[PDB]
Structures are given as C-alpha cells and as structure tokens.
Design an enzyme around this catalytic site. Structure first.
Site, PDB file in Angstrom:
ATOM      1  N   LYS A  23       7.084  15.120  10.154  1.00 14.38           N
ATOM      2  CA  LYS A  23       7.188  14.295   8.915  1.00 14.38           C
ATOM      3  C   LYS A  23       8.256  13.195   9.116  1.00 14.38           C
ATOM      4  CE  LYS A  23       7.835  15.331   3.887  1.00 14.38           C
ATOM      5  NZ  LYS A  23       8.902  14.335   3.643  1.00 14.38           N
TER       6      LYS A  23
ATOM      7  N   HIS B 246      -0.384  -1.631 -13.758  1.00 16.84           N
ATOM      8  CA  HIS B 246      -0.120  -0.366 -14.476  1.00 16.84           C
ATOM      9  C   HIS B 246      -0.340   0.856 -13.572  1.00 16.84           C
ATOM     10  CE1 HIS B 246      -0.467  -2.578 -18.424  1.00 16.84           C
ATOM     11  NE2 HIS B 246      -1.468  -3.205 -17.809  1.00 16.84           N
TER      12      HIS B 246
END
Ligand SMILES: COc1ccc(S(=O)(=O)Nc2ccccc2)cc1NC(=O)Cc1n[nH]c(=O)c2ccccc12
Ligand SMILES: COc1ccc(S(=O)(=O)Nc2ccccc2)cc1NC(=O)Cc1n[nH]c(=O)c2ccccc12
Lengths: 448, 450, 458, 451
Positions: free
Chosen positions: C315, C178
C-alpha cells in the site's frame, strides 16, 4: 408618527410602536447591520424583567400593582407576542444597555394600555443596572438553546446514526486509510464511529453547562451589587428556574468575573465548534459514499429532496458558519476591560446563531438524510473482496515461516494472499480450499 | 394560499408570492437559519438575468417578446422591488441552484401579470447552468459593494481623520510605548497614522478588484461552456459593464478556476479583515484617549449620542470582530471545493457581503458622529508633556544625567513642569540660562512636526 | 562559563557566547517556548546594523574604524556565521528590543576579537531605537522571503501544473459537480485551473509588496525621528536596496503607521492564507484522483515516495498532498495569530512584533519548501489512467444531450437508462435500439457522441 | 554513510545514526519546517513501545529476551538519551507512520549494541499499526501536559491572584465600565475576578480529560483490531497507567471514532483557547493599571525586568495567547478533514496542541512568580481618586437634589478636590445633611460593599 420629548429635543416614533424615545435614538444611532435581537433574546429579556418585578415585589420595594403589570407585560414578551417591538441593531452599545432600555419602554407601554403607569428605569429597571441585565438574558437564551433544543436535536441524530450502525453491522466493505485501499470494515462500524462523535458532542455541551448557566443578575453596574438587595441574584435565579424548568441557571460563582468577562460564551462556542468539526467529517464521508454513480464510490444512496447530496452540503456550510462565529466570539471575549466586557451584543448574536444552526441542520440531517440512506450491499461486498488481505489467519495451518514466504511472494508478484497460497501448491491435508476461504473471509477480517 | 402541481406531488404557495413550486420545496427543505439572500445578492441576480436575456435576444436564441418581459422583470428585481420574493435559506444547495431557480420563477410570475408566458428553465435560464449563475451574481454584488459603497465610505473616514490631523498639527502630548510615557508626539501625528491605515485599506481593496470582478458566466455546468454560445461570457459581461458602469467586471481568466474555486472572495475577505484590524487599533486608541473624566487619560472628549460612553468605538470594534469571524468562515468554504465545483457559495456570499455592508455603514457613522466632533484638551496635554520625566534627556549636556534624574523625580513627586523644577532646584546660571532651558524643553520641537 | 556585571548585579554567560549581560538576562526572563529567531530574522538584523553603521559613518557621526568593524561583524551575521548567538525566546518584550540588544552585543564581541571597542548602545545602536529596528528587520526578512524564495517556488509549481495541463490536453473524463457525474472535461482543463490558482497566488503576493516592503527605520522611539538624522531612513533604505537588490524595500509612507501598526504583515498573511486555500483544493483533488487503486477513483497514479504500511505491505499513500494540506492548516492558524497581534497595538507602538514575525516568516518558509517538493516529487511524475477515464466518459448518461435533435430527448433518456443499466457505452446502447438509419448515420452518431469535442478543448 | 533496504529497495544512511532506511527516506521526503518531534512526543513514543513489548511478552507472543531489549531501549528513549535520533519533520505522512518507524528503527539499533536482534516491524511494531500508535503517543503526551504541567501551573497563577485579592481586600478605587469612571470597587475584588477566570480555566481542562485521555491503541490499521489480541488495548493502557500514574489514560469508547477523528485534541484546544482569552483580559488590565508614571492610570507598579518598568510579562502573556488562538485554528482545520477510517492531520495537530500546553504552562508560572507576586498598589492615590469621582455624588441626590449634585461633581473635577470637600466648600452642610450623613453616604469602601 407620534412625537416624544427627550432631554435633547424632539423624537418622532411610529404610532403602533410600544418602544419610546431612548429606543428611537438607538435606531437612529446604529444603522449598521439592519438586524435586531432574535426571538430567543427578546424572550429571555421578557423572562428576566418578569422575574426582577416578582423579587422586587416580594421584598416590598415595588408596589404590587406595578409588579403585576410588569409581570403581565413581561409574560407577553416571553411568549413571542412583541417580537416586532425590538428594532435596535445588534451592533449597539457593547453592554446591551440600548436593548435593556428597549425592554423597559415596551413594558411601560404595554402596562399603560391596561391603565397602570410605570417608569421604565425607576420601576421596570428597579435593582438592575445597564450592565448586569443584557449578559443575564444572553446566558438564559444560550442555556435554554443548549438544554431544550440542541441536546435533543443531537440525540435524534445520534439515534439515527446508531440505528444504521446496528442495521449495517454485517454490511462488509473495504477500509480506506489515506484514501487508499485498506483491510475490510463494515458500514455499521463506520456509523458506530459517527454515532460516538455526536454522543461525545452531547457530552461536550453538557460539560460547559455549569459555567454557561451562570447569570450576572444582582451585580449591578460594576459587580459589587450596589443599589440591589444582597440576595437579588439568588432570588431572581430561583424565579427563572421555576418559570423555565432550566435547573442549569445559577448565580455567578464570582460577580466580577460574570461582568468583566463572557468566558462562558467562549467555552460553549468551543463545544459547538468541536460539533461542527465532527459534523464536517460525518457529512463528507456520507457525500463521498453517495458519489457517482459511475465516477464515484457509489456505496450508498441518499434520499432525493443522480441525487445531489444537498443535506451534507447544508451541514458542511453550517459547520463553516459555526467556525467563523466561534472566531468572532473569542475575539470579543478577549477584549473586555476592567469591570465590563463591551462585546456582549456581538457575542450573543454569534453563539445563539451557532446553537440555532446546529439544532436545525442536525434534526434535518437525521430525518431527511440518515434515516433514509440505502446501502448498495452487493457493491460493498465486491469492494471488501478487493481489499488487501493478511497471512496471519493462515499461521495455525502453514506455520509462521510458510506464511512469511506467502506474504513475500504475494508482494513480489503483485498477487493476492489467496492466489499465492494456491500457486505455491499449499492446498492439501494441512489446508483445504474451505479452510483458506474461511480463514480469509472478508466479514471475519472486519471482526464484527 | 394558492396551490401548484410539482413533478413530485403538490405544494401550497402563499397567494401574494411570485415564486413557484421549486422555491417552495427549497423553503420546506432548508428551515435552518430563517435568513435568506440580502438585497445586494437579489439585486445582482436581477442584473445577471436581465443581461443574459439581452444577449440571448441579441444572438437570436430567444424571442424578443420574451426577452423584453425578462429584461422588464429583472429590472424590477435589480431596483429592489421584490426583496420579499426570495424566502430560501442561505444554507441551501452549495451551488446556490435553489436561489437561481427562485429568480427564474419570480421573473416568470412578474411576466405572467403582463400577459407574457416564460418557462423558468427554458427561457429565463437559457444558455445558463445551475452552477455559473449564483457565483457570477455573488462576484457582481461583491464588486459593486467594494467600488460603489465601501471605497467611498473609507474615503470619507480617511478625510475625517486627515482633517483632525491638520486641526491638531501643533497639539503636543506625551507619546506612549508599551503603555508607558515616552518622548513627545502631536495628536495630529497620531491621526495622520490612523488616516494612512485607512488610505492603505483603500489600496488593499483596490488591489483585490482584478480577481474579485472575475465572473464565471458562460462556463455552464463544469467550466467548458457546453450548451452556451462560445462568446456568451464576454457578451453578458459587456452588457453588465454598459448597464452598471462597473468596469471591474470581467470574464474569468480561467473558466475552470472560476467555478472549482471562490479564491477571489477569500482574497477580498483578507482585505476586509486587514481593515477590521486597522479599525480596531484606531477605535481602541480613541476610546482610551476619551477615558475619564477623572481616573482615565482624559486627552479628548467624544461627542454625545466628558462622561459620554464611547459607543461608536464599541460599534466599530464589534463590527471588526464580526468581519474577523466572517473571514474564517469564508476561507473554510473556499478551501473545500471538489473537482469542477466549490459548493460553499451561498455561505461564502452571505459572509463576504455582510463584511462589506458592516464596514461601509460603521465607517460613515464613525467618521460623521465620532471623529468629526472630537475635542482635544490642548492646554492639559501640553502641561503633561512639559511635566514628563521622558523630556529630561536634552538637559544632560548642561547639568549631567545624575541631576537630570533628580529633576525628573522631583517634578513627578511635586506634580510640576520640568521647567519649574529646574528653576526651583536653583540650576539657572552660566551652565544654563532661562532661554537655553526653554530651547532644551521645547516639547513641540521634540515632536518634529512640519 | 564567564562572569559579567550588569547594573542589577553579576551575570554568568557561556564561554563560546558572543552575547553579553542584557541578552543573558533576557534568556533568564523568557523561558517560554525554547525557540529563538530563525536564520532569516538574524540575517536581516545583520543587514540592518551594517546599513546603519554605513550611514552613520557617511554622515560623520561614527568613527570610520568603528563603522568598518560593525560593517564587517554585521556581514558575518547576515552570512549565517552566528546563527547560534541568538538564544532569546520569540516570546520576549513585544517591541523586540531584547533581540535588537542581542544583535548589538554580538556585533561588539566580534569587533573586540579584532581589537576594536564598540559600545553596543552608543555605537551599534547609534541613530536607532529599541522600536524602529526589530520591525524594520522583520519587514526586510518578510520581503526577502516573498521575492527571493516564495515567488520562485510558486512559479516552479505553476510551471509543473501547466506542463501537465498541456500533456493532458486530450485526456477526456467525466466532470464531477457535488461529487456526482457531470458532462465531460479533460484532465488538462482541470490542471489549467490548478495552474491559474497558483499564478493568481503569485499575483496576490506581488500586490502586497508595496506595503510589506515599508520599513520603520529612522522613526526612532515614537515615529518622530527624534535623535536620528532627518534623512536616516531614506539613506539606510538606499544602502539596503543597493546591497540586497530587493527593490520592494522603501521608507514608510507614514512614520507613525509604520510603528503603531504591523498592517503590512496582516495584509501579506492574507495572501499566504489564500495560497493555503488554493493548495488545499489542489492537493485534495490530486489525492482523490490517485485514490484506490481498486476501491477509489484511480484517475491518476502518484509517484511512490516510501512504504505506507507493514500490515498492508504494498500500500502506497499520497504523502506529499498530506504534507501540503498540513502546511495549509498551519498557515491558516499562523494567519489567525498574526491578525490577533496586528489588531492589539496601542498609541505609538504595536508590541506583538516577535510573535507576528515568527508566524509570517514560518508561513513563507513552509509554503516555499512544500510548493517545491509538491512540484518536483508529486506533480512532475503523475501519470493519467487515460483508457479508464475515456471509458467512463463514453458510458456517461450526461453525454446523451447532443442526440436530442436527432431522436428527441425522451429517446435520449431511454438510451441513458439502458446504457447505465446494461453497463454499455452510449454509442453501443444507441446501436442496440436500432436508431441508426434515416435521421442518423453511424458517422453522425460518432460525431454527436465525440466526448473530447463535448469538453470543448481550445 | 552505509547501505540499508526496505520493501521499496536500498537507501544510503549516515554511517553513525541509530535510525535506518524508512527514517532516512522521510528525512529526504519532508524537508519543510526543519523542526522535528518535541521531547514530550519522543517520551510518549518510548513509553508506548515499552508498554506494547510488555503486553506482547505477557501474552506469550514475543520472546522474553526480545521484549526485555525493547523495554530497556524504550526506557532510554523515554528518559531522553536519543532525541538527536528523531530527525523527521513534523510535516510528514498525516498518520505519523514515519515517526512510528523512526521509534522502531532506533529501538532495534539500541538492542543490537546489546547483542539482541529485533526486527523493527515484526518485533518492535508487533500487534500495532501506524494508525493507532502515533495518535496514542499524541494523546499520552497531551494528557500528561494537561495533568502534570498545565493544571499545577494554572493553580500557582490562581493562588498568586487570590493572594492579591486578600492583600488588596480594602484597596478601594474607581470602577471602570466602557473605560469610563464608574462606582467604586477594590483591587481585591478585581483580582478575585482574575482568580475565578483561572479557576474556571482549570475546570475547563479537567472537563476535557474524559475524552483527551482516550487512546487508540489496539485498533490497528482501520479500528477493527485485526492483527492484535482482542484485549491489547486494555492491557497496554493498564501498563501505561501503572508506569505514568496518569489514571486519566483510558481505552477509546469507540475504536473507529478514535482513528477516524482527533475530536479530543479539538475539544482540548478549545479549553486552552478559552484560557488564552482569560489571560488576555488579566494581562491587558494589569499593564493598563501599571501605565504611566505620569500620563497613564498609575494604579499599580509592576516589578522590574519603579513606575517606569515596561510591562514585559503582560506582553509575553498576550503574545502567547495570540499563538494559542492561531494554534487552535490549525487544530480545528486538521480535525475536520479526516476521511473514512483515518484522520491524516495528526503530526500537525500534535505540534500545535502540545505547543499550546507548553506556552500556557511556562508563561503562567512566569506571570505568577515574576509579575503578580511583586505588584505594589498606589493605595492612598487610588482611594483619593475614588473619593474625588463625580460617580459617587449619586447617593447625595435625595439630600441636595440632582441640580446641586451635578454642580458638586463639576466643581470637584475642576478644582481637583474630593466630593466631601466640595460639598463642604459649597456650604451644603447644615440644611441638607450633617457631616455624619455625608460621611455615611460618601464612604467609598462601603459603596464597593467590602469590609
Ligand atoms: C489618572 O491619573 C490622575 C488622575 C487625576 C489626578 S488629579 O488631577 O485629580 N490630581 C490628583 C493628585 C493627587 C491625588 C489624586 C489626584 C491625577 C492623576 N495622576 C497623578 O497624580 C500622576 C502622579 N503624579 N505624581 C506622583 O507622584 C504619582 C504617584 C502615584 C500615582 C500617580 C502619580
Ligand atoms: C492622566 O491624568 C493625569 C495625569 C497627571 C495629572 S497631575 O497629577 O500631574 N496633575 C496635573 C494637573 C493638570 C495638568 C497636568 C498635571 C493629572 C491628570 N488628570 C487630570 O488632571 C484629571 C482632570 N481633572 N480635572 C480637570 O478639570 C481636567 C481637565 C482635562 C483633563 C483632565 C482633568
């Protein structure tokens, strides 16, 4: 166990049943899903039969005694009093004739109990066919579901999201693009995006209403209006608009289009499917935000019903179901022939369910998840203070050339902009530490 | 209207409900669809709880007294006696934990009535987790649906189509390609094609069973089997196979794949989606052949339930549309697992088990109340075949393609057989005897039946 | 440019073109997509026309000098030499008759350049129809794409995931259920899961081949075999299997089913759709595990493949998982188009073949190419952040359970509370509450809190 | 080959090509489909780069000489001179970074020939991100495809269907419900239904334009506008509206929604899917009407590409509809799976929605011009069937009774005669009804309720 006599022999019927022989034959012919019409569909068939009786009486085609009994019996059905007298499977004759006759026979039985004798076909089905009644009740139910239920549920969810967008306007955090660290945003800005998606959802439902609200009633067997008064349609719609307050109900632009196709249901499902797509993005971000606490992002706390994100899971599962229902709707919508689309009961089941699932889960998500979310403000600030920076806000102080040099050195040595400025000996008269920290402030970088 | 005490307050439970506080909280948390688990799912949950109790007892982990009460209660659930004791919505926590707890609570209340005290978690959920149980029940229900119900229903439809193909072996008619007239076929040949589609459907369902019958039981919370016996899975599966006769049930090949994904349901849905596609073609051809009785093709008459509406083909094509929609929802849920758990299981289970049920029920109805009683317009179909421009090609070698075109055009305009048009145009002679004409225009021979 | 004469008038054709009048008509009739047959479909049409000429020669129906010229021309097509001579749109006549005639015309023009006259219809189309040929070529191309390209590509990815599973056998981490903290697993166990999904994907492709490989050839216009030899299908298949080594090719079980329907393409697309669902789970988990590096999960590092951003200079982005997830979306869309075409046949012919063929063959190609790239340029170079993973597992409230039988569940829950509050390991928190002594040595604690043994690695 | 560089180091490029290092890395990283960006997508990227350089020039952020070289090079890209300089696969980084960089590197190479030095990122990508440019290009291309191409193609198909509705206004025939004979209609009425479906289609496309035309430009990396002027978005949209004449182009209502999601592509695909559903009904009915010439319905004849023509254009239309439905499922799947500040399914969603626009535009014009315009009705045949159908005996019931009405319908079918001639042949004129009353009750055109 009473027995009734039908052109092709004996028909045993439960004693408390208000349905008669034709309905019992349909129960025997279609044991497929074990599920019949929903309350919304029964209600809409009741509203349509009461309105048809009203217009037939107003035009002097139906004796006022019979009209009054049909209208009273129809008001009971529309008020949920007989939701157990409709046992026919969803997977029936593709016109929905079987459910149309079910409504006729139940009305005949209710009226017989008050002393009045009605013929199901000659009286209760006067000026109607087996083919313009069930699509009309479908579009009444779909239009009521959109206007009276879904739109207000989505507005409730919009309002909960917008309230968080304002509460969290200055809760700075790291941006994420491709799941990778990006420049700062605020939790408020993210929630303003979720709010817009649900607002655009309401715009999408509103935009389909001119066609969703089109009713076939008056077109009879093939769309020509044979065996109905010329103005049956406009008169019946006016009674339905007056009784329901649903100004979106309207006569079909083209009586042939309104029976040969159910394109209005396909259009509307597209809006519901877009909303499911929007809700999947919102629900997925929220369970990710709440993930962990140790192994996850731990940005927010979801209210408990280590909390599992049970309402994001119910939302994403509802979204899956609306996408499946949408495929079933379009498949039936494409497969009409000549004067009739014969997929109406299946399309009706699927669009009315999509409306119900989105209405119920949106109100639950709004009230029991969104309203109660708490932000881990200090953790989020620490993530923002770990986002990449840019040199642009130093331009006015160190010039384009030095800034370009800071940006290059930071990338080469895998240092922050801040440390690189310090290491290059740039602190002094042209740039205090105060200025550095104000120029690179993460909340200012989020432009909130 | 009886009252229970929860860790998080109090909760009123209906007096005749055998569920308890956890189920009633789930009823309050998920008022979404108004539709709960189907009979097949509830039966599978009973079967699984029974077998788990049998194994916990066999391994000495659970007192025989308590194991016996669970086995007796679980049997009543599997036998369909408590279908109204599962009120939780399909749209619940994605593991199906709520419905697992619903089963544990109902078993404890059944046992209480017989004098035995069971803790729902500690006794009925012993060795199990909130995450390996619901998917195991789903795969039990789906395997049983495929083997015991859909395959025999499809075999009945196959046999009905095959019986028509034999009865109509020599029922010659116009072929149709692009909806346009073409060289002759027999109704028997077309029905042999429908039969093969349904036989291939059975092959498709049989081929998915090695992965559909894989059960997660024993993998507990994440697939590792922590807090279960090492052999719990193989023991429970062997009890399930011994009790149900379903030899297709098996422990998962990989315990992490069996909880992180539901790829076996996606796979099986694709078989059901292919069957829906086949049934759409068969049902569409049958309602077209029955169209009329004047302005349509009027090849066959459908039995009443030749002005009968084709209501069973309409039922079949509506079911197929639903199976197609359900298949999209299953794949969507399938794709969207994360890490150690796919949390779309209740929605996936509803869609797969419905697809199995609709196809099973509509296939038997279609076989019995439509196919078995079809009647062919035999003489009519042959006269159309014998009057078609499409059959003049075997005349070319005797009279040339130019005169063959003139025969075709006149037969169509005058609504006469190609035979009668060749005779009427005075073409019988040395270039073409009456016997040679009847050989060239033998429409049944053109169909090449056996 | 160079003029020709159809029965409906005079047609202009580019100079360098080996196609003739019927193909040039079809070019003018279907300007819809601007896209024609792929090289795999062209190749299959060439294989089929060569096998047909060989059988017609063997049966004494076609003059050996004509058969030899068709065979030599058809080998040039199957070898990719004429990939620019098929200009007809995918969205053509639904039997694919236009593309069949394109093949016949191009073979005739090749034969003419070597002094042999072939009639496109009476020679190159001998014993064939406009309706059993294009579906035969489609099923040859789909069988070839399954057996020669997709299954080896999936095996390469299976083998890359399985090697990671073995390398990371002892790399303990917290499970996530979950998206929340759970009991320990290894990165190796998770990757063994991914490997099983791809191995199962291969099993799913293998299970569809008995029906994907069925060919309609010999059934002619309606499936009866009228105007073909009775054994044309078994003879053409025998040649195709001998030439290609594709043992999965077979004559259809039922000649009507094989032309009235394309159920074998719908079946195969379902297998490809299931692989797309597996790849979505695998690729999603891998980009999540590589997320950050400071604000995400930072469980693994993906090999760098290109700069991500100019605003954010350093990045780097999970570009291969993004390519995989996008391919999977395209396969699920193509799958829906295939099922739609498959359902809507009528009587003796399904007339959605060109559209079904485009979608199935593209799904095969995208899955083959992206699987190989994912295996070589992403999975093979992944590195694990081992110390990060073990630190979180050793600090997890989820690991207190085995303390129960020593200190009781109430004291275990207090150790969890405190550890999680004071940012300590469970081990250290137990020490810091003086619980070591009578009913628990320091050796006994290290044994109960052994996170790798809790993962229960084989 | 020649040597180039980027932040990651040095790369070999085709000595000739107008792209550079980042494009070549993407050529090596993504050999998946072998298909690149379409003409419309390349055009949109050139329009956008020219508009960005214009606004950067107007705000004094970019030197006039550099802005001019960009605007000139971007005009060459938009006009379609450089399509072979976009070799990057559709299946690239999900932001469309790679195709953004392709546009920047090509623009820089063009300007260099003209002796002007532009930095692909510092000048050509000024005030822009990856994340705001590619979706803006996508929404321009989709808006242009909706307004300038699909709506006018649907209008031509509507008008052809409406022209048939008028020409066939009194062409009475059998209705069909459930595929079974029903009371009369006219071909004109059926064609007025088909016309309404296409008119409703145009209404569906117009209804989506308020959100389809929303552009992300100005939101930069994450939606915040960091590193762009505050009004970059409004200024660039004004230049795009003035250059294209597409007034439907507008700034995003919410800069975060415009990058975190592509919900406007999903909405627009829903409109296209509904049109595919309508065209499936229209084309199926037309190919059935033309079926025969002996054993089918034989109501109409389709023009050749007389009675034996294959319905090839209905087959192209129903195959295009299947593809639009497939494309629609792919677009929704991409749409749902964004995360945080960016949906990274843009190149795949763009491929599918622009293809759906193109297929529907092109097949609608072909259908209108080469199938609808040339249909011919079997007028006398259709009337005779309508006059011979057991469906029209019902208005006799009140005169001759149910039992005799049924006996009339049975004999008419068996003898293949009209209802009128069966009622006469049964000797029912005189007692029950006159010829005047029979001709009033069996007037099939009046029964269809047409003049
Ligand atoms: C569903 O097709 C039919 C249904 C009923 C009947 S019937 O039994 O009632 N007989 C009949 C004869 C003439 C007029 C009306 C009816 C015939 C037909 N087909 C035809 O008349 C076929 C046909 N033949 N020849 C032609 O030159 C022609 C031209 C245009 C269209 C069709 C054709
Ligand atoms: C595609 O339907 C048709 C096509 C062509 C023609 S035709 O012009 O060529 N004429 C002709 C007449 C008889 C046989 C062959 C040809 C008639 C038909 N329909 C019919 O004959 C309809 C029909 N009428 N009456 C019957 O009692 C009957 C019984 C069974 C089935 C149909 C019917």
């Amino acid at each position: 166990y009473r027995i009734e006599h039908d052109t092709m022999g004996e028909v045993r019927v439960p004693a408390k049943a208000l349905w008669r022989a034709q309905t019992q034959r349909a129960v025997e012919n279609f044991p497929i899903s074990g599920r019949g019409l929903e309350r919304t569909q029964i209600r809409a068939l009741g509203l349509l039969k009461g309105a048809c009786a009203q217009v037939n009486s107003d035009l002097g085609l139906l004796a006022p005694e019979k009209a009054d009994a049909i209208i009273a019996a129809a008001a009971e059905i529309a008020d949920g009093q007989h939701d157990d007298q409709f046992p026919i499977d969803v997977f029936q004759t593709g016109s929905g004739t079987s459910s149309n006759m079910n409504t006729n026979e139940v009305i005949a039985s209710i009226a017989a109990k008050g002393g009045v004798t009605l013929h199901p076909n000659d009286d209760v089905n006067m000026s109607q066919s087996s083919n313009d009644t069930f699509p009309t009740a479908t579009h009444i139910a779909a239009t009521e579901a959109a206007v009276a239920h879904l739109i207000p549920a989505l507005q409730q969810l919009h309002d909960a999201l917008a309230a968080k967008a304002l509460d969290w306007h200055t809760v700075v955090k790291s941006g994420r693009t491709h799941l990778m660290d990006a420049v700062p945003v605020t939790l408020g800005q993210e929630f303003s995006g979720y709010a817009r998606q649900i607002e655009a959802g309401i715009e999408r439902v509103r935009a389909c209403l001119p066609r969703l609200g089109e009713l076939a009633i008056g077109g009879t067997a093939v769309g020509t209006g044979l065996n109905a008064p010329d103005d049956f349609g406009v008169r019946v719609v006016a009674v339905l608009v007056a009784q329901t307050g649903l100004s979106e109900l309207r006569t079909a632009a083209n009586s042939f289009e309104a029976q040969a196709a159910r394109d209005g249901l396909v259009e509307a499902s597209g809006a519901l499917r877009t909303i499911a797509v929007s809700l999947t993005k919102i629900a997925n971000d929220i369970r990710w935000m709440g993930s962990g606490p140790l192994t996850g992002l731990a940005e927010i706390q979801l209210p408990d019903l280590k909390v599992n994100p049970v309402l994001p899971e119910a939302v994403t599962q509802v979204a899956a179901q609306v996408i499946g229902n949408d495929a079933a709707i379009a498949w039936g919508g494409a497969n009409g022939a000549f004067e009739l689309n014969v997929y109406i009961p299946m399309m009706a089941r699927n669009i009315l369910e999509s409306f119900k699932l989105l209405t119920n889960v949106s109100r639950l998500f709004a009230q029991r998840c969104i309203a109660g979310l708490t932000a881990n403000v200090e953790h989020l600030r620490r993530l923002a203070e770990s986002s990449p920076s840019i040199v642009t806000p130093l331009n006015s102080a160190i010039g384009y050339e030095e800034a370009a040099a800071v940006a290059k050195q930071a990338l080469k040595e895998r240092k922050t902009i801040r440390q690189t400025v310090i290491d290059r000996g740039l602190i002094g008269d042209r740039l205090s530490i105060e200025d550095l920290d104000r120029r690179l402030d993460v909340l200012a970088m989020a432009k909130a």
